[PDB]
Amino acid sequence: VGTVVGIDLGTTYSCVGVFKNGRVEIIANDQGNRITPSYVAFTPEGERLIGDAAKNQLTSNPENTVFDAKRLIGRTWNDPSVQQDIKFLPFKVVEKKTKPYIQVDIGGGQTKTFAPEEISAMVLTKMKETAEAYLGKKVTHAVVTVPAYFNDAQRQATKDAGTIAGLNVMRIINEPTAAAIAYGLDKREGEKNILVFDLGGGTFDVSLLTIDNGVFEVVATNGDTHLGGEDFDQRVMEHFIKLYKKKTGKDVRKDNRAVQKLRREVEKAKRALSSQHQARIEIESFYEGEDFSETLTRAKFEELNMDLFRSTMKPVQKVLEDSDLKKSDIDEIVLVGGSTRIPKIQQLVKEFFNGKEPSRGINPDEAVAYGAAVQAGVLSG
Ligand SMILES: Nc1ncnc2c1ccn2[C@@H]1O[C@H](COP(=O)(O)OP(=O)(O)OP(=O)(O)O)[C@@H](O)[C@H]1O
């Protein structure tokens, strides 16, 4: 099996880790990033871009970019969830072999269709390449994570994505479990209840797990399938679009690429505001050959999103109800997902649990890959 890698295949961002020289190493991609966008795009010359290069490609044709394949993976075309999601996806989705295939122009007017697992395979291929560059050798085997609520077809389609990518997915493990393993919560005595609060780019998952004898049970799951960091970005986008209109008289949404530029800068500023109190947003040739320069405080970022932040507590309360537990029954709280880097989110979860500190010390957008890599280390032997 060689050196088995651990992969978090995320809706919006993916992460790969390996066990080397006695510990888990989270691997940076060829752009220097320890997470990679689950994104595909095409150049006009017909080059396929994957990851950062695909997300960062300026385009007036969002219909030929592909993302959010995890929303479609392992589902039938006629699945009501698919039919709802296709309303919001800018790329074409068509019924083929009972499934939602993605249809795009890949260069020079050539049209191709891809199954969701074929798009996910492209992302896994990039994750494989990232690991191989670090290791200085090929890898053939992986542990891959999925949401705990994933069903038989979604799990199998994830394994199939691996196969297409040249990875033998040896184990599929649940995301909240992988996070708990990252924090060593499996190597604990007695029965314990663990609440995993996972707030990512596109989705919010809460899971109640019990751990006993090093065996995990997923007791209940809840969340919101379309709440995450992208929604916080959009609140900030709406803020600056409106300010630019009141300031200049003009609506920037007429230019795809301007919106794209602002989105990239807003996301970067949001990330800055998890560790500083103000951030500068600056864009040359933003709109009509005019420059954009604005600032955003942490207080304003929180004010713009407070309702969304506060909405994350309801699914936590539902998971407790469904597990027949009260707050005091929770022995461990694990924060997962990039958006839990937000100070206000950390504050809100602590307050919900009457001052209880969550687990700490692993970057939350890496914790799932980390636990996958822990398991991969044992399988590497
Ligand atoms: N320092 C920070 N402060 C605030 N948010 C942060 C960061 C760093 C990253 N992010 C935001 O985290 C979101 C991505 O989360 P993720 O867990 O990496 O994504 P993923 O595993 O795909 O989650 P999901 O889309 O499957 O729910 C994205 O929205 C990132 O913008």
Numbering used by the authors: 27 to 407
Give verbatim excerpts from the published study on this entry.
Full-length GRP78 consists of two major functional domains, an ATPase domain and a protein/peptide-binding domain. First, there is evidence for the relocation of GRP78 from the ER to the cell surface in numerous cancer cells, where it has roles in promoting cell proliferation and metastasis (and references therein). Third, engineered agents that fuse a cytotoxic agent (e.g., a apoptosis-inducing peptide or taxol) with a peptide specific for the protein/peptide-binding domain of GRP78 can bind to cell-surface GRP78, become internalized, and cause cancer cell death. This finding raises the possibility that, similar to the protein/peptide binding domain, the ATPase domain of cell-surface GRP78 can be developed as a novel functional receptor for delivering ATP analogs across the cell membrane. Therefore, we studied the ability of GRP78ATPase to interact with three ATP analogs (i.e., 7-deazaATP, AMPPCP and 2’-deoxyATP) and the known substrate/product (i.e., ATP and ADP) by using surface plasmon resonance and x-ray crystallography.
To assess the effect of nucleobase modifications on GRP78ATPase binding, we performed SPR and crystallographic experiments with 7-deazaATP, which has the nitrogen at the 7-position replaced with a carbon. SPR measurement showed that the 7-deazaATP affinity for GRP78ATPase, regardless of Mg++ concentration, closely resembles that of ATP (i.e., the Kd values in the low micromolar to high nanomolar ranges). For crystallography, soaking with 7-deazaATP resulted in electron density corresponding to 7-deazaATP, but no density corresponding to Pi and Mg++ at the active site; this will hereafter be called the metal-free 7-deazaATP structure. By examining both structures, we noticed that the atom at 7-position, whether the nitrogen in ATP (N7) or the carbon in 7-deazaATP (C7), makes no significant contact with GRP78ATPase and is exposed to the protein surface. Moreover, various additional substitutions at the solvent-exposed C7 of 7-deazaATP would unlikely affect the binding affinity to GRP78ATPase. On the contrary, the 7-deazaATP structure reveals that the C7 of the nucleobase is surface-exposed, allowing various substitutions at this position.
